[PDB]
Amino acid sequence: KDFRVQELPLARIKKIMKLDEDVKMISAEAPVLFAKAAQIFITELTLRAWIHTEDNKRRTLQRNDIAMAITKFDQFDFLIDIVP
Amino acid sequence: IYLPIANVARIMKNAIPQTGKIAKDAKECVQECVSEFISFITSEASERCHQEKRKTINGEDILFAMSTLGFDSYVEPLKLYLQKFRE
Amino acid sequence: VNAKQGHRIXKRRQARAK
Ligand code: NA
């Protein structure tokens, strides 16, 4: 539940945040928030990909199910470059 | 750099029905997506902090960046997870 | 394109190329 989320490595999240050219200091709170955000994001992304998995009559979720979902949901537009 | 794929797989499998299956290539892809989710929020929060010559990205910055970029629905759950966490 | 995201997406493209 939330405990699944507690298992997410905060250091890994801090390291990603620190790739950003304008980030020196980061509050402790930030990676924690991202940990949970990561969970909500992944869940909705996959639910939405799953729709396309099933429309295609498969029980296996594939990179193109993700790609279709990114295009049908305006909230996933920032992913356009990630999943061509 | 990315979150462990084991972690990502377990969240994805909770999302789908028991019966279902996830191809490794779909897990690697969600891996990449998550890193980009983080960088994209961070980038927004960070550009804001620089404009007001602020040297730390705080949790409020992130939460406001989400709101602004159309992840407003994430805000109450994140806040509550924070409360709960450091309660 | 999501109007809320658009400007941030254009910037991020610049950041990733670098
Ligand atoms: Na769109």
Author numbering:
A (entry chain C): 36 to 119
B (entry chain B): 57 to 143
C (entry chain A): 302 to 319
Give the published text.
Even though constrained helical interaction motifs generally show a tendency to inhibit PPIs,1a only very few have been reported to directly target transcription factors with sufficient affinity to enable the inhibition of complex assembly.12a, 14 The nuclear transcription factor Y (NF‐Y)15 is a trimeric complex (NF‐YA/B/C) that binds to a particular DNA sequence (CCAAT box), thereby activating genes involved in regulation of the cell cycle and DNA repair. NF‐Y subunits B and C form a stable heterodimer, which by itself does not possess relevant affinity to DNA target sequences (CCAAT box DNA). Only upon availability and binding of the third subunit (NF‐YA) is the transcriptionally active trimeric complex formed and DNA binding occurs with affinity values in the low nanomolar range. In this study, we aimed to inhibit the interaction between the NF‐YB/C heterodimer (light/dark grey) and NF‐YA (green) to prevent transcription‐factor assembly and DNA (blue) binding.
Two derivatives of 19‐mer peptide 2‐D were synthesized, one lacking α‐methylation at position 272 (2‐DN, N‐terminal X) and the other at position 276 (2‐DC, C‐terminal X). Knowing that amino acid α‐methylation can restrict the conformational freedom of the peptide backbone, we investigated how variation of the α‐methyl pattern influences binding affinity of 2‐D. Only at position 272 did substitution of the methyl group by hydrogen affect binding, resulting in a peptide (2‐DN) with 15‐fold higher affinity. The highest affinity peptide 2‐DN was co‐crystalized with NF‐YB/C, yielding crystals diffracting up to 2.5 Å (space group P212121). For the higher‐affinity peptide (2‐DN), we obtained X‐ray and NMR structures in the NF‐YB/C‐bound form clearly showing contacts of the α‐helix and the extended N‐terminal stretch with the protein. The overlay of 2‐DN, 2‐C, and PBM in their bound state indicates an almost identical peptide conformation. When superimposed with its crystal structure (orange) in complex with NF‐YB/C, the NMR‐based conformers of bound 2‐DN (light orange) show a very good overlay. Notably, 2‐DN binding provides a thermodynamic profile similar to linear peptide 2, and it shows the highest entropic penalty (−TΔS=16.1 kcal mol−1) as well as the largest binding enthalpy (ΔH=−24.8 kcal mol−1) in our panel. Therefore, we reason that specific release of conformational constraint by removal of the α‐methyl group allows adaption of the correct binding mode. In the presence of peptide 2‐DN (c=10 μm), we observe a considerable loss in the fraction of bound DNA (32 % bound DNA).
